[PDB]
Every structure is written in C-alpha cells, then in structure tokens.
C-alpha cells in the first residue's frame, strides 16, 4: 500500500559539532595536525574552517579554500587509513557533486559574489573520508580506546588570488586562519554498550592516486602513451585528468574564448593566463585526449572510445549530473557514487593494468576564436601542451576491523 506508511523506530541519539585542537603552526606551506578528542561515542562529519582575505577582484579566485587544503591524511592507531589531495577534491566535485549542492560547495570554498580586493570571508571545506559520507559508517571512538584517531593536513604555499597573482607574491597578504570541527554522536546506553564490547567490521572506501607526466605533440600529432596502472583492491571506478600544474584546476587548454583566458575576446586577451574565476569548461574542443582504453593483462578490457565518451556518457550512465571537460571517468560499478557496492574490479588480482592514451593534434591557434569555435573533433588549441600532469585516481573498498579497543585494515595494499 502507498497510503499507510509504517515508519520505523530508531536508536535515540544526539549530535554536537565540537571544536578540535590544531597542533602545529598554521600558515601557508605548513604541516599541521589534529588528534581527535574523545568527547562522543561516534564521529561523522568533519569541517575545516578557513578565514582568507582576497587580493584581487572579480574572477581572480578559483576554489582557494579547497586548494589551501593540499593534503589530508586519516590515521588510526598509527596506521594510515586514507589520504586525500587538493586535486582529488576538485575532481570529486567535478564528478560527483551537482546542481545547487555543488554551487553551495563553491560558496563554501571561494568568492562567488564579485567581491573585491580586501574582502574577507569564512570558508568551509567538508572532509570526505568514509565516515564523513555516511552516518552508517560513523567511526566508533568508544571502540577505539587504545587507538588514536588523527588527521594530518598540509597547507598549500601559494594560492592564486589570496597569496599570489600568477607567480608574483602579493604584499600585505595575511596568513590564513584555520579551525577544525568534528560532529559527534552521543549514543544511549543500550547501543553504547553494544559498540564497545562487540567486534565490528566496516566496509569502507579509500582513495588511490598516481601522478604522471603527459606527452604533447602537434603537426604529425596523434601522440600516444601507455601508463602502467599500479592499483590494488576491489575498485569501483577510475577517474583521471590532465592539468597544468601552474594553474590550480586547469584541466583544459587556455584559449581566446569567453571565460577561457585572461581578458578573452578583448584587446587585453592572452592565452598564457587563465580567467581564474572561470577555469573550468564544458567545451570538449579544449581538452586533449582523443581516445582511450584500459587493458588487463595485455588484453583490451574494452574497445577504444573518444575522450568525450568518458567525460559525458560514463557520467551520464552512472552518477547522472554534468562533468566539466578535462575530467574523465570509467566505472566498474553500476552506481559509483552510492556507498552500497554495486560492481567492482579487483586490482590486487591483476598482474598488469594499463591506460592506453592517444592525444588530439593540437595545431589550433588558441588566439583565434574562429579557430577554436569552428574546428574538428581530433584537434585542440596549441595551448594543450601545458596540460603536462596526468592524475589518475581509483576508488576502492577495504575492511576496517575494530575489536578489543583497536582497529585495523583487513587488507594491506
């Protein structure tokens, strides 16, 4: 029946977001850390609060608060459970976040109101480890009595529009201010007792990353390249991008098209500098990578598909939102964004895995709007040569076993 719902009764509880103590000196390029205080029984969400001051004007910022959090390592009992990166967040956002939620995330990560020089704002960078994504995986502190739960952060040294303008330091730039808040759940005795005495097993996810250098060519392009993928465990999907390390989230070539370069379509237009505030694009014409395929033990896991296939279709068929050009996906799961496992590939059972790539023939004059807006599928702007860093990510499952006051991962890979 659709007209008489029977809601179920749950275990009584309470939530409180409690401030953490940050060990170390907060400031650009500094390594700082935190040992989660043992206030509640379980912990869920974790937010990093940053206070920054703008150094330029409209469109001079691009996810500053996000880039600021260069790395985040989650360690339990001295053991590293997972580690995220600056570029992972950007990629995660481009892939799995969407619509108003995604816009809210940008409001939390940078200036989106045309703010000017001197504007000071509060930023919120929500962590995304296994227990930060589902209360069903809430980390049980009351069960990790002899194990310390720690987070290790590394703050970027240069952040465009805050600290620097291109490669020129900005005078007067204020050192950032940081704060760490953790949400705790307080359980009622019944379940609290159960949590500290019984053994537990959690099916959690981890992030795997490998940075590589891209090829380049034009003219007789159709440059090629094979990357040996050294990943392990049952993997849900693969995500990768090609970015110019110089500019934070630049995953596509800079060009003389609106929102594609500093002062595009204008007399001041360049192609060396991006229109920071609008670094991302949906225009497939500005992304390298003509085709791609994955290979298992020397065999095609599937036939070659253009790079647009992994940017549009793979994301359409699963996680149905919209991904900016330059980010690619290949899912082994039916629902890669769902916590419930739905199809995986066990990499720790594959001797050889490879990502075979074929790039487009640059040759397009990035300074010409008519050349960029009016061209062929297999070519892109000569500016593509700057997309030198190839970042490949794999999201896998693992098992976290917690008993007798301590936890540990079932599989060490």
């Amino acid at each position: 029946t659709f007209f008489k719902t029977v809601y179920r009764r749950y275990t009584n509880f309470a939530i409180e977001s409690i401030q953490q103590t940050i060990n170390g000196s907060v400031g650009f390029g500094n390594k700082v850390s935190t040992q989660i205080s043992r206030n509640g029984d379980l912990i869920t969400d974790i937010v990093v609060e940053f206070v920054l001051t703008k150094g330029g004007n409209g469109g001079t910022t691009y996810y500053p608060a996000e880039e600021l959090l260069q790395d985040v390592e989650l360690e339990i009992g001295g053991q590293r459970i997972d580690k995220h990166y600056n570029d992972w967040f950007r990629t995660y956002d481009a892939l799995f976040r969407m619509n108003d939620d995604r816009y809210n995330y940008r409001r939390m990560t940078d200036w989106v109101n045309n703010e000017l020089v001197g504007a000071q704002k509060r930023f919120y960078v929500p962590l995304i480890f296994f227990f930060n994504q589902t209360p069903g995986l809430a980390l049980p502190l009351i069960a990790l009595q002899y194990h310390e739960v720690k987070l290790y952060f590394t703050l970027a040294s240069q952040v465009q529009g805050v600290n620097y303008n291109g490669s020129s330091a900005i005078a007067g730039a204020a050192q950032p201010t940081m704060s760490v808040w953790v949400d705790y759940i307080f359980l009622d005795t019944q379940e609290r007792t159960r949590f500290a005495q019984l053994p537990h097993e959690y099916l959690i996810e981890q992030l795997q990353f490998t940075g590589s250098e891209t090829a380049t060519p034009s003219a007789t392009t159709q440059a090629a390249q094979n990357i040996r993928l050294n990943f392990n465990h049952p993997t849900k999907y693969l995500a990768w991008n090609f970015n110019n390390p110089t500019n934070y989230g630049q995953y596509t070539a800079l060009a003389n098209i609106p929102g594609a370069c500093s002062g595009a379509g204008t007399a001041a237009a360049t192609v060396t500098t991006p229109d920071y505030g609008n670094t991302g694009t949906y225009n497939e014409q500005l992304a390298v990578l003509d085709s791609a395929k994955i290979q298992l033990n020397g065999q095609d896991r599937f036939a070659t598909r253009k790079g647009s296939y992994f940017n549009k279709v793979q994301p359409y068929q699963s996680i149905g939102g919209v991904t900016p050009a330059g980010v690619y996906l290949y899912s082994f799961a039916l629902k890669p964004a769902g916590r419930q496992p739905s199809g995986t590939c066990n990499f720790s059972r594959i001797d050889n895995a490879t990502l075979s790539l074929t790039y487009k023939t640059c040759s397009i004059d990035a300074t010409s709007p008519a050349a960029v807006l009016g061209n062929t599928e297999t070519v892109t702007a000569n500016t593509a040569t700057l997309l030198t860093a190839l970042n490949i990510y794999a999201k896998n499952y693992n098992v976290l076993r917690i008993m007798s006051g301590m936890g540990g991962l079932a599989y060490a890979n």
Copy 2:
C-alpha cells in the same frame, strides 16, 4: 542481484483533483475558508489557484501568489492540527526546495518572464501540511465521518507589484480570484473497508512559530540578544530569519550592488527600496548575525559558530541544496527533509531553551559598491538596521489518532 528486480503489487486505486467550495468573500485582506467535501476516501495534495494582474514591469514582483496566502490553518473536528504562514513558505522554499523543482515553484508563484504592466497569470500555491507531502500520510476522510476537515485562509492586504508599489496603492488594481482544488484517492473495497473500521495512528509533523523583534547597533556594535524559545514536542530542526516587514522576503540588507537595491550600480540607485524581483541573495556579507548558539537549561547545546555556518554547512550536511543568505538552520535530525524520523530533540522535556545571538557591526556604507564588495566578516551594510523581525520556526512530530469516525492529536502542545 541487480539484474532481476521484483516489483511489488499494490492496492488498486484512482486519483482525481476535485474543486472545493470557498466560503466567504474573496478579496485582499479577507478571511475565507473551506470545508473539504467528502468525495473520496483519502485526500493528498491541495492547491490554491490565484489569478492576479501585474501592476508594474520587470522585477517588480516577488512571490506574489505565495505572499497572498498569508495564513493557512488545517482544522479537524473543530481542532487545529497545524497552521502555516506566508513567511514559512518563503523560508521552506529557501531551505528545502531546490534546483529545477524550486524554479518550477517560482513559475507557479510569480512572473519570471519579464512580463509587463497588465499581464494576467494563473498561480498555483501547493499546500504543505503532513498529508500534502506524502501519500503515505493521506488523510482518511472515510475514517473521519463525524469530523469536519476544514482549511482557513487569510489573504494579504497589500502585495507589492500587484496591489501596491511600495506604500502607494495602485489604481485599477483588480481584486484577486481564488480557487481551491483537492486530490482524492478512491480505494477499492478491500482497503476501503479496512480504513473505516480499524483504528489508525499517523506520525505527522507540525509547524511552530514565534515572531520576535531584533536588536540593531553599529559602531561599538557586536550587539547581543537572547531569545527564550518556547517550543514543544520532539523537534526535527529549527529555522529562523531576520526580515524587514516592509518588504516581503527581504532577509538581507539592501545595498548598492547588482540585484541588491532599486536601480543598483546606476544613477537611480537607492538603498531604501529593494530590487523586488531579486530580493534574495547568496552574499553572506549582507546578512546580520555574526554568531549563534543554542542553550538547553542554561548550558551550551553546542559551541558558537558564525551565522554562515547555519546558512551553508548545516544545509550542506543535511538537505543538500543551496540556501539564500539570511535564512538559518540547525538540525537535530540526520535528514530533516525526510518524512521518516531521523533524530529529534523533545522540547516538551526542556524547561529552558534559548537562542543566543550576536550581530555584526553594520557600519558599512550600503551606498558604496567598493565598501560592500570589499569588506570584513564581522560587518555588513548600515542598511541591516531594517531587519527588525526575527522569525523562528520549529518543525516537530505528533501523533494523529483516528478511530470510531473521529480523529485527534495524541499530545496537546
């Protein structure tokens, strides 16, 4: 298995939207009502149809059809079950509605096509009581044989862009036309019989509201204020806003910034009048409230967080969409928008509850774009002094017991 779904068979039924009889004289500032006719077995959605005629041009309207429905009281058997308000709808929309659905809601509530003077449109204001939100809570008329189900509406007297322009009545303004439609479900004998003989219990939600006056100060601002919260029952969350009663949904200070005031960035720019069509904003810089915390029996339910935390993070962590600046949320539930209860705080078990507030130091020259777009976290436009009304809402659960032809609420608070 993911490749062989077993759909379940349900109880046969039919839906029909049937027109209601409106008792009383329809017109601005009039109280009118309706006794639901006993056509079907259960009732779900309820829509109020309004026909209005524009009195100005582009951007002169702001959710007219919504504001028109000043109050709505749902009464059963002479007993008031719940009562919503003009400002609740605005707040509900800012918080729980999102994306295309939210845009569709605006299409149903006002002119969004740059329409001019004289444009006449059909508006649809969907009610949002417990049975209007889930067919699982469909109100069982066949079980309320001796109880009358009535709705009591109160129409606003002045609606900007329709009836008035600021405080100046608009000549020729047509009285509104109103219609009430209710969706009925017709059940097959099996279940119909079951519905009229067995006792029933419904876990429903109610709205609680308390209007208060705000503080103000600048210069040596950092004005403070504590509000005693008199709420009852297991509560899912708290939502509140500070608005200038003069302008319908103004939850933020007016300023000389695009979309922030009448003719902003222009020679005609003001700061006394809003850019009606664009009353809402995402810019945290224009909202009062620097920090806030809630207190139970003289103790901090949680540490103080800036007002941006309740506007961005609380909504990000639950109900993941995007909320305009000026609306705040503090959830006791994991999923405040879900009908299924997921965490509550029982206010009828708390002797003292308080909302402790600390405002920002206005001091900013609302007439200066460079002052508004380039400032500090703890200050806002001097225009903030107009946000004098503090509206606090609490959404709670209660039990509706229906038997022997009549219904009633389990807890009278």
Copy 3:
C-alpha cells in the same frame, strides 16, 4: 539504527560496452538497422554515436543528434516490442530529465558552446527502452537463444543547422557518421545457469503514440476539439504537445521576445523563424490550449483545468523538476518516472476515452513585445496558428515472458 549499515553482497559481474554492426547505408533519410551480437549474457544501455558538422553559427542548432534519430524500433524474435520517436525524446527530456543531467544530455545532443560554421562534434544519443533504463530489467540474451534482438533506425532527412537552413539545403553538408554501442553484463556461472534454464517474466514499459491535427481560430476563438484516444493497457500517464512540424521542437508560438524568434527585440526580428538555439520556453503566454479534461466512457475523469495546470502542477506533484511550456502531462501514477508501478489506468478496459480541448484566443500581435509581455491568460500570439500537430503519448506496462530460448509479450495491444 542509523550508525551501522549492513551492505548486502551481490552477484559477481562485469560490464563492457561493445560496438555493433550497422546494416544498411548510413546517410540522411536512410533506414538502417542492427542485430545485437551475442557477446554477453545480458544487455543494458545502448548509445548511438553520431558525428556531425555545423553549418551555421551560434543558436542555429536545436538537438540535432536527437532529431537525427527519427525512429527506433526494438524487435525481439521478429516481434516489435516497442518503438520510439524523434518527438518522444524531446518530450521525454522536457518532462523527466532535469537539472545538470538534462544539461549533460544537451551536451550529448548538440552544440552548446557557441560553436561556429564548420565545427565538428561527437554526439551521444542514449536509447530509452525498458532495459536501457534499469539494470533490473537487463535483457537476457543468454535466454533468447532462438530469438534475434534487433534495432531499426530511421535517420531524418533534414536537420536544421547541419543539413539545412530553414528549407534551403546547405552546400557541402557532410553525410552523418553513425556508430552503435551496447553495454553487456557478464554473469558468473551460478546466475548464468539460472538465467538460461528458468522461465522469466519482466514487467516492462512501452510507448504509445498518435499524431493528430490541431484546430486554430482567433477573434471569436475559444475553438474546441475532442480527440478519441485509442490507447491500450495499464497506463502510467499521458503526455502531449502541439508543435509546428516545420521547426523541430517548436511547442510554443514564435514571438518578438528575447529567445522567442529570429533576431527578436531587434530590427531584424521576425516571427516566421525561430531563434533555433532557444526554441523552448517557460512562458505560458506563448502556448495554445486554454483548458483540458479527459473523458472515460462519456464521463469526466476530472474537472477542466487550464493548460498551465498540466504543464506546471501535474509535473510538480510527480516527477518534480521543470517542464517547458507547450508540453503537458496527466499522470495516473504517483511516481510516473519511477520504474516501480505506482498507479495505472487500464485503457484496454475502456471502450471510449477522449481528450477534450479548448484553445486560447490568439489575437495577440506576435510582433509586439508589449502585447506579448503584457496580456491576458486566455489569449496568445497569432503565431499560435502554426502549432498544427497534436502529439499524444501514453506510457504503459506489459509483460515480457522468456522461456525455452524465446520471448514474447503477454498482451498483444
């Protein structure tokens, strides 16, 4: 409990998108087909890849790749299971797709980056038959050993902005390139065995369509018209539109308003030609149809509601997104977009079904912005006379029984 989720273990499997062989000569106006190759055990998604070259500039294209796929027939064992159309996709998109997903779909179907003449892109048109929408209905090839699974496509002859400009062929226009890819699931022995030996039953959906000619009148308009609806089976909903066959997705009247006609609000403005790139609108003022009701065996299935009710409210109450003006919906289901049946009307049990229509009185001067942006609910632009084709669609359920190596539909209607 909300803090200890028990994920369920599933049947091991793998996915691979494999290219299909296209029988027949690919080219505008050609009929081509495909016999699905028997590579895997089950098949899910199916994508048609098209490579087209632009013939004009910004706003000269409107879902080209979508229109290109004029018809698609799914046949099993010589039997036609379902058949979709060009206009069904447009209507499906307007109704059930939404937000970022819907924008991604447009990226897959046409140029959205202001591309110019000569721009060549890769398009992806995802099929939407029963097994293309849910892996739970994956078509079991291993169980259809003696039945051929075939797809029959018909390519449009003229596609605005690619092949033609209005009715003028474009010289040099390249013939399209087409590719068909099917996703297969490879099952492990356990379940594979089970799939090829046990009888199966699938509750699937089909599309029903009937094209009719519209009435027209103005002045003493309020023209009327009744259409005998010849549909069959348990039907989830009805969807219909009035379009000018000349222009692909024109569901509304052309007018001298931004995005409503070629060069609107300009000296070059027309009203004979649409602003192709922006053919759709949300402005109810440009849609015909003043009111409507459905009738069963000579009786009102429900009271008459304005056309805006079926365009805004019906879609708001179910499938909550936003539908462009000109597309209408009347659902018999609680959740028409959900695969799980939730309310249906059995048309093969109704001797007479009728759609009663009443059009608006055109009379509005489509060339006048002040006339279009400032008018009454019961009138529209005189241009409405061009919306001559009435397309009515009904989505129903049926049963696909598969055993002994062959499949067939339970009900032949």
